[PDB]
């Protein structure tokens, strides 16, 4: 057993939103045994000094595109609209791939670096949607990301993505990535068989994640809806990015939401990325259907899209989580830093109603318990007995946080650095004193850097 | 002489906007002697390995309120509009002061902490606007901020501020804070005589800084205009925050800009904080007059105000710099971090015209050369022969920056940490390996933390 003792502040996000001062967290295997003051060092084989730190549930990034880690800070993609952006990324990724510079071995190391950064930013679980499946046959890309993740000890959800609707038939997808529906379903069934850990505290899970309504066939969506029921896995896709509604009506003469509902996706098995520009009247329907929504402030701003109606979703009682998206439109994997961005960026939408502005604690919940709920993990996102020992702590005693009166608010509103001090995943200490415990950071940096096209 | 050798990237912001790869910077006393490849270590007594780093001119924070470092992350002030916020801050500071908890010895230590955070964030010059002068005499608050800055060795401008317009005659402010115009003027004269260093590479300078049109008498503005001419110092005030136009119209029946014009402030001696919501017709007048503008993205968002028309100012040829404002409305002193706020936040205002969005290089220019010009410092903000050896360097070889294709864009668009690696002010190495070389980090944190009310 491991005991973290004398944490300055502990934010549980439990059902009464308890917070604790000068308290302890007790851990046994993958699970939290207790959260409270002066816990006994009974069977404890190690005590970690928590003084001067704030502890949260591990952060959960409910929307990544790991492979985009190779595409950061490209000058020609710095200031572009979505059309130019999408064009530029696919062009580069397919070009590199054709030249043998972008194989699963390269994606493995790119995933390794972005996931390591994730751990260092206090992120204990990542859901990746790998979108790059060149040739009719999707290579071992997903296996590569899963291998990086398991080597690191980070909890990992792989949402198998696709582009089953080629332009060669009214679609918008290049036929280089367009697989037959049945081939996609079959790859997924195999992934689940090899990789899925459905038990509580499972470290690798599979989700089914079409690229989106404008890019995939209704048959894929229905095929997935059926699988989700069969195997109790979750459904994930992009939702109401700008221009989507136009494309959906053009192919199906209905809204993206009407479509999803028509094809079995209006269910509590689903979590949806962005949800930037939904029709207001559809929002209560998301509520009743029980879908979850992942807020991605960085990409939404970066593409010039604007502010998703997050207050509205919360008002409706819709589950809201948080994510960074891939590093080709972020361009970092810093989930904590993005929370500050959401905290501030939303305010000018309601100049005279501060009560509607998202609070630090609401955002911190999104990034932990909210995301947990998006991924269908009731074993994550909350510091309480019986939940997973997935814990992220930050120091409060740096010169850049002097004068802070509320540590949770300080975490978002102050600081030169979002580096986590102590990070535990599945009861395993992976970061301590802001340094990787098991990973060879310098070796990973050199190996991955050598492989960037 | 000091040689920084083999910097991976050097951004000069010189007149040709030169950048260099695998290049050196040579320093002799307070000034830069050379910038280029393979510089001679002829008369060098210390060589510093710059490999894996990007070097910029030191960042210049053109707008701070250092004493607000004591008021960070206050829950009652988390989501409030300007009116409530300003009452909350004035109230607290008056209260603390009345209770003997907020005198100059306290402000000295708050300033030391925020100024050290500044150095650790790559900021090499700070302009502070201190307006808190309760009582029947002008206490030694400014003296205290200067003492902190001189101890640390950070370059410092003090804009002596005030609130001379009492609520009894239109001012939105209690007469506890109101000083006679003549007291402010007399104090400023003594500050200039005592502290001002007008020579090139001067380390302390005085500016004259009324809180703003809604808060000070026209006579103070005119007095300062004369004093700035007579003593060749600069003028600084808040400018076009929302509601200013209303108050200005009520009191004087003119716009804040016409007021400034009328009372001697339409000149190249002036720099203006925020400038969020000016009438578009006035912008060309700003340009003709030659006033500079400080962009403060974090406060503007935090207060619900929105986006200053920065592209418009740039298009007009107006000098644009950057700052953080005080830590009660930020709530950090992290200038580099706020640049990312600006890079992203401006985009949604022009969804279809990415060419209007501010670029990483434009933003970095604001935080360096642009701020230097606000502060009237031709000796700062540019890495070239004959300018001050004020230099900030960040490491590029961290795992959170793998995949970065352009280091300058990467500096803004990626990273878990904004912590500078190497910082030089006036030829003096102050930060190395992300640590103070002269200041006792832990001691300063301990001492200041004990003084926070
Ligand atoms: C009163 C005019 N404006 C203004 N003042 C401050 N600070 C003082 C009270 C130290 N902060 C801000 S942040 C928008 N605005
Ligand atoms: Zn996505
Ligand atoms: Zn100010």
Automatic annotation (TrEMBL), chains A, B:
It comes from the Bacteria. One of its GO terms (molecular function) is amidase activity. Residues 54-400 form the Amidohydrolase-related domain. Zn(2+) binds at residues 63, 65, 238. It holds the Pfam family Amidohydro_1. InterPro entries: Amidohydro-rel (IPR006680), Metal-dep_hydrolase_composite (IPR011059), Metal_Hydrolase (IPR032466), MTA/SAH_deaminase (IPR050287). The keyword Metal-binding applies. Keywords: Hydrolase, Metal-binding, Plasmid, Zinc. This is Triazine hydrolase.
């Amino acid at each position: 057993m491991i005991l973290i003792r004398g944490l300055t502040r502990v934010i549980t996000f439990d059902d009464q939103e308890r917070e604790l001062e000068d308290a302890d967290i007790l851990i046994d295997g993958p699970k939290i045994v207790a959260v409270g003051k002066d816990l006994s060092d009974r069977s404890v084989s190690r005590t970690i000094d928590g003084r001067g730190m704030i502890a949260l549930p591990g952060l959960i990034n409910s929307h990544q595109h790991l492979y985009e880690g190779a595409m950061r800070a490209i000058p020609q993609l710095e200031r572009v609209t979505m059309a130019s952006w999408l064009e530029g990324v696919l062009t580069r990724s397919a070009g590199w791939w054709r030249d043998g510079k972008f194989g699963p071995d390269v994606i493995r190391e790119v995933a390794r670096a972005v996931l390591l950064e994730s751990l260092l930013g206090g992120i204990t679980t990542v859901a990746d949607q790998h979108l790059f499946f060149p040739g009719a046959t999707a290579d071992s890309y997903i296996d590569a990301t899963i291998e990086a993740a398991t080597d690191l000890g980070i909890r990992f959800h792989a949402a198998r993505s696709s582009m089953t609707l080629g332009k060669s038939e009214g679609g918008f997808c290049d036929d280089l990535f367009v697989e037959p529906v049945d081939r996609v379903v079959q790859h997924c069934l195999g992934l689940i068989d090899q990789y899925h850990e459905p038990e509580p505290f499972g470290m690798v899970r599979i989700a089914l994640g079409p690229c989106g309504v404008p890019y995939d066939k209704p048959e894929l969506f229905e095929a997935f809806a059926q699988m989700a029921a069969d195997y109790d896995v979750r459904l994930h896709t992009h939702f109401y990015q700008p221009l989507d509604a136009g494309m959906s009506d053009h192919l199906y003469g209905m809204t993206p939401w009407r479509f999803l509902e028509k094809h079995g996706w209006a269910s509590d098995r689903v979590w949806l990325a962005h949800a930037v520009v939904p029709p207001r009247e559809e929002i209560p329907e998301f509520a009743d259907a029980g879908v979850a929504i992942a807020h991605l402030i960085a990409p939404d701003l970066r593409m010039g899209w604007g502010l998703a109606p997050i207050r509205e979703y919360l008002d409706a009682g819709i589950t809201v989580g948080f994510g960074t998206t891939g590093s080709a439109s972020n361009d970092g994997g810093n989930l904590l830093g993005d929370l500050r961005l959401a905290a501030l960026a939303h305010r000018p939408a309601d100049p005279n109603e501060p009560e509607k502005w998202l609070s630090a604690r609401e955002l911190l919940r999104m990034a932990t318990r909210g995301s947990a709920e998006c991924l269908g993990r009731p074993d994550l996102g909350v510091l309480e007995e019986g939940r997973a020992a997935d814990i992220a702590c930050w120091r409060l005693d740096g010169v850049d946080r002097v004068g802070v009166h509320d540590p949770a608010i300080g975490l978002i509103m102050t600081g030169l650095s979002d580096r986590a001090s102590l990070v535990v995943v599945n009861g395993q200490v992976l970061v301590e004193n802001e340094r990787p415990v098991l990973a060879d950071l310098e070796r990973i940096v050199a190996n991955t850097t050598a492989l960037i096209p």
